């Protein structure tokens, strides 16, 4: 099953410079897990999202919907939607300007 534990097996395989997985409350409604990861270049991000779809296509999940990769024309942000987690790929410069880690951990106490 395509769950949270093999994300650590998959992201640390390609030497991700940053991993941030957040358990969102069940009250707040987007997903179950929120994954924010960074990269070295925009090339390293683009092949990284194109391999995390490679594991899902062979692991099965027959009845589940497919996967669309959003952001194929931009370089600073790449995001992939799934049923029980949503992964988000940025650059270390883009990490700070959006401050996306503190949004889902502090819903209304931030800048």
């Amino acid at each position: 099953k395509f769950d949270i534990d093999m994300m650590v097996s998959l992201l640390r395989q390609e030497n991700a410079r940053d991993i941030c997985v957040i358990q969102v409350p069940p009250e707040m409604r987007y997903t179950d897990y929120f994954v924010i990861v960074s990269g070295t270049s925009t090339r390293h991000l683009h092949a990284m999202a194109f391999y995390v779809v490679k594991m899902y296509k062979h692991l099965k999940c027959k009845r589940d919907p497919h996967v669309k990769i959003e952001g194929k024309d931009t370089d600073d942000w790449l995001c992939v939607d799934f049923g029980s987690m949503v992964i988000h790929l940025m650059l270390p410069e883009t990490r700070e300007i959006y401050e996306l880690e503190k949004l889902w951990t502090l819903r209304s106490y931030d800048d």
């Binding site: 987007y30 929120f34 959003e70 952001g71 024309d73 931009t74 942000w77 995001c79 209304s108 931030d110």
Partner: protein, 115 residues
């Protein structure tokens, strides 16, 4: 719905969003085969003499039943590449955006509230 030159409001923490003086952005195009724009449709937007792409998030028009019918036509700003301009969104945003086709996972990571 949102045709050409409706008045909308930008719901963003942008420096371009808190406009003084003529504080009413005017759209110039909808990116559909109709003039009609619904929840999750690209539109253009003329702000301060600058034309900018935009994304409809909720309108004043009655649509389907269990979807919110917001009393202001509020619209989030994106550039051509697809990510939003701002850093935070404080207004409520409907959760009808996830299933619909488009770069909408960029928007839902910015919303503080999901009603």
């Amino acid at each position: 719905a949102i045709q050409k030159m409706t008045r909308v409001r930008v719901v963003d923490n942008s420096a371009l969003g808190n406009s003084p003086y003529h504080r009413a952005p005017r759209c110039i195009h909808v990116y559909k085969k109709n003039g009609v724009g619904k929840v999750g449709d690209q539109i253009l937007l003329a702000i301060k003499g600058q034309k900018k792409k935009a994304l409809i998030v909720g309108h004043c028009m009655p649509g389907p039943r269990m979807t919110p019918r917001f009393d202001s036509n509020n619209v989030v700003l994106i550039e051509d590449n697809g990510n939003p301009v701002g850093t935070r969104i404080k207004t409520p945003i409907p959760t009808s955006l996830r299933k619909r086709e488009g770069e909408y996972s960029k928007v839902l990571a910015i919303a503080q509230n999901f009603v």
